[PDB]
Write a protein that binds this DNA or RNA. Structure first.
Ligand SMILES: [Mg+2]
Lengths: 57, 252, 234, 117
RNA sequence: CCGAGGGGCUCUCGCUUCUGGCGCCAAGCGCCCGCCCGGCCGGGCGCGACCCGCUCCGGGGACAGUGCCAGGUGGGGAGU
RNA sequence: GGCGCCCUGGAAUGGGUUCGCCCCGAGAGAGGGGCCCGUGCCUUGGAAAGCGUCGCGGUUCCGGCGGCGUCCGGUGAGCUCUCGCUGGCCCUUGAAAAUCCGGGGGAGAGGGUGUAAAUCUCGCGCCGGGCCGUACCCAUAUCCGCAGCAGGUCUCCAAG
């Protein structure tokens, strides 16, 4: 609908019960969940592969 | 007694540019602590089109170092880039396509677009579609580097001038014929009020120095001096030579 | 102790938002500020004539304090006590009708057009002259004038501090003409500490040009060539 | 002391409430438009007369500086009757015509007969 | 440079680069107040976030520029 | 009607498809769901009004009184308008702001319990909505051309 009629609805006709509800498209949320986790984990990996690099030289 | 056509282009009444549907100035982001000393990461969001420009643009969102805010730049699109590409900008940036880094750190013979002629001027030289500049000759004492402009003319510039690595997108554009009078009309409707150029021989002695006579002839020599006044500089202005060109250019 | 985890923030390039630091150098001041600071710098950068460089060489704070103490009990007459001195004058004419109640009421004269008349008649004892007078030409002759007339002069820091001796804002000059008999050695005590520095050193204070020093960022790269030119010899 | 922004903006100084030591006009002017000056005539035409009984209204001619809140109190306080709603009309010979519809408690006819018509 | 546990003619910078993610309004530590009789609440300051200093940072610079005069040129324009 | 929405499952002897295309191991076909537009129909409104027809009163308000009717189907390269789906053409890429809304964060705030707090984009109820324009002509007679002037002057609706 139009922008000024969105002040007349209640917020169940305007978003979806997920996270990132009425703003993203439920698979880019899914992609953002996997993209966030799986590179915070490589920052664990680059932390420990720098940990076992300086320590044996 | 009447003023001539090119004299009326300086007042800028209908000869101002057509700038409504343009997007903004296509400029490198201003230099601060991140690019003087390190690098900063940005992701290009969309490749957009200016009306009246032959190159396309690239809008790149960076992360503000001082405020929590994402702020969007507009770059001259180097050729080969795609959306969702990381773009790195700094002194310690790594020399890839689309990365912008100072000309004093990059090696000799790398191809450069959209470079600064004085430092921090946010990109002035080598910006048209398909054009680039080449760097040679770093002088690390009295830090000056010379580049080679798209006109084949070399210029010694400052070393801390900043520049995006690559060639400007949209190249090969002038290979296609305009091919009819209608598509030249739409070309300049995006640009200016300049397109249907009446020859000065075809107009009247009020309107041009060349017009008049019972035959369409120029009459007077069409090479004129450089210190001719306004309304008389028409034709080959301070021409060093004329006739169909031989050799390459043979004058530095 | 239970959880209470430490979470430091990396503040390098390309990490967390930089914290609010000082930024008092890199701040765009109003143009009355940067006029006020650039002309202060440019009295250090230019070759200042020795008559303007008669100043910027003042009494140190121990000598100024011994002076302003002696100038404090020779304070001029405020309007409060001017009201009651004229009441006590009429009530003694109503009492005694004396010819001369006071031989000389001692006081310091203040004001340049008052002081200069006393210097050139040699009726002054010690001329305290200010430091930051806003056009210098109001004042610049008077160190050269006290030397010829033989009056000992001294430059004190601040035109507003000796202007508080006189119950006003600034007063630019004060001068002792007559002191009391119990302070005659006190005014004579500081008078050879002063003319040793100013009057006897007139030939030195007149040769002495000033300013002409470069800023710290340019005197630190001329010095960097001097380190390399000493690195060359050995 | 610190200055966490690179901008000098001018400090919030104090602004005194203006209290003078003589009034400039010595008295409030009385309103030239009171509830007597709102309402000029009752309009008494054939189209304004069939609008009394069939419509429970009654038609006035009003000064053009009045609005429908002022007409609603001028008719109420001069004639001791309630007002449902008002409609207004700058009629093309210059003046403002008001259509005051009375409440269902009152009758437009007997109010018309006691105001003159 | 020599060589013993190390010395500093000469030196280096730093912490962000497989990916269309997130990042601010401090954690922590040290001190100090009213609050608990050798213990509990709510505030304060500092270190985290080094120090000093006279251009905001770079680029030119006694040139450019401008004021004035002298000489060229000047149908671009005016008068006849 | 639309969906570049989901789940199961895996396709080749390739199949599903359009007027044309196009789509598929980045998941086709097949099966079961979800969402958006619903300007159509049904229902409330709502038959009480509207119209058609047949009467009957009331001189005058009459927004009279009454009987019956307002019913079934089909069709289309049809015209007009709207909604949609997919293409093409561009050295042409076809506006800004006011407003409005979702999301992320989590500084805060709340009753502290065998009772109710802060809050509520839910269902109802109360009050208010000032100012100005509003007739008519809009043209071979209300405009401009000296005039009721074969001139000129922006649009919408349009049957057999
Ligand atoms: Mg031509």
């Amino acid at each position: 609908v139009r922008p000024k009629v969105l002040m007349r609805l209640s917020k169940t006709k305007k978003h979806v019960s997920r996270a990132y509800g009425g703003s993203m498209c439920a698979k880019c949320v899914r992609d953002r969940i996997k993209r966030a986790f799986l590179i915070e984990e490589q920052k664990i990996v680059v932390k420990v592969l720098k940990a076992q690099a300086q320590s044996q030289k | 007694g009447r003023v001539i056509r090119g004299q009326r282009k300086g007042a800028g009444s209908v000869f101002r540019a057509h700038v409504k549907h343009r997007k903004g100035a296509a400029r490198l982001r201003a230099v601060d602590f991140a690019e003087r000393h390190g690098y900063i990461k940005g992701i290009v969001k969309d490749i957009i089109h200016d009306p009246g420009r032959g190159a396309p643009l690239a809008k790149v969102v960076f992360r503000d170092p001082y405020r929590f805010k994402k702020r969007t730049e507009l770059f001259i699109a180097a050729e080969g880039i795609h959306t969702g590409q990381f773009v790195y900008c700094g002194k310690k940036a790594q020399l890839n396509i689309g990365n912008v880094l100072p000309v004093g750190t990059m090696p000799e013979g790398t191809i450069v677009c959209c470079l600064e002629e004085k430092p921090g001027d946010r990109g002035k030289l080598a910006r048209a579609s398909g054009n680039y500049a080449t760097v040679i000759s770093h002088n690390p004492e009295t830090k000056k580097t010379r580049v080679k402009l798209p006109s084949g003319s070399k210029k010694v510039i400052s070393s801390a001038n900043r520049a995006v690595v690559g060639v400007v997108a949209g190249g090969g554009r002038i290979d296609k014929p305009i091919l009819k009078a209608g598509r030249a009309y739409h070309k300049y409707k995006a640009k200016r009020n300049c397109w249907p150029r009446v020859r000065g021989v075809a107009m009247n002695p009020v309107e041009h120095p060349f017009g008049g006579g019972n035959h369409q002839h120029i009459g007077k020599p069409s090479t004129i001096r450089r210190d001719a006044p306004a309304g008389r500089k028409v034709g080959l202005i301070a021409a060093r030579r004329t006739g169909r060109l031989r050799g390459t250019k043979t004058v530095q | 102790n239970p959880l209470f985890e430490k979470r430091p923030k990396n503040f390098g390039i390309g990490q967390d938002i930089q914290p609010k630091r000082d930024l008092t150098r890199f701040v765009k001041w109003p143009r009355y500020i940067r006029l006020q600071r650039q002309r202060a710098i440019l009295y250090k950068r230019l070759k200042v004539p020795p008559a303007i460089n008669q100043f910027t060489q003042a009494l140190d704070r121990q000598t100024a304090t011994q002076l302003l103490k002696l100038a404090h009990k020779y304070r001029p007459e405020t309007k409060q006590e001017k009201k009651q001195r004229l009441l006590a004058r009429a009530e003694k004419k109503a009492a005694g009708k004396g010819d001369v109640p006071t031989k000389r009421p001692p006081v310091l004269r203040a004001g340049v057009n008052t002081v200069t008349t006393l210097v050139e008649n040699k009726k002054a004892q010690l001329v305290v002259i200010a430091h930051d007078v806003d056009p210098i030409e109001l004042v610049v002759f008077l160190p050269a004038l006290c030397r010829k007339m033989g009056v000992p002069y001294c430059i004190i820091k601040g035109k507003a501090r000796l202007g508080r001796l006189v119950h006003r804002k600034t007063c630019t000059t004060v001068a002792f003409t007559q002191v009391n008999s119990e302070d005659k050695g006190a005014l004579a005590k500081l008078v050879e500490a002063i003319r040793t520095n100013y009057n006897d050193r007139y030939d030195e204070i007149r040769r002495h040009w000033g300013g002409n020093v470069l800023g710290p960022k340019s005197v630190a790269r001329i010095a960097k060539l001097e380190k390399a030119k000493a690195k060359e010899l050995a | 002391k610190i200055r966490t922004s690179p901008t000098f903006r001018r400090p919030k100084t104090l602004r005194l409430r203006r209290q003078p030591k003589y009034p400039r006009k010595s008295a409030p002017r009385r309103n030239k438009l009171d509830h007597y000056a709102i309402i000029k005539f009752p309009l008494t035409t054939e189209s304004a007369m069939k609008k009394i009984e069939d419509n429970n209204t009654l038609v006035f001619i009003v000064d053009v500086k009045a609005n429908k809140h002022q007409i609603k109190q001028a008719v109420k306080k001069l004639y001791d009757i309630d007002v449902a709603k008002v409609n207004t009309l700058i009629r093309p010979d210059g003046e403002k015509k008001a259509y005051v519809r009375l409440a269902p408690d009152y009758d437009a006819l007997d109010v018309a007969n006691k105001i003159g018509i």
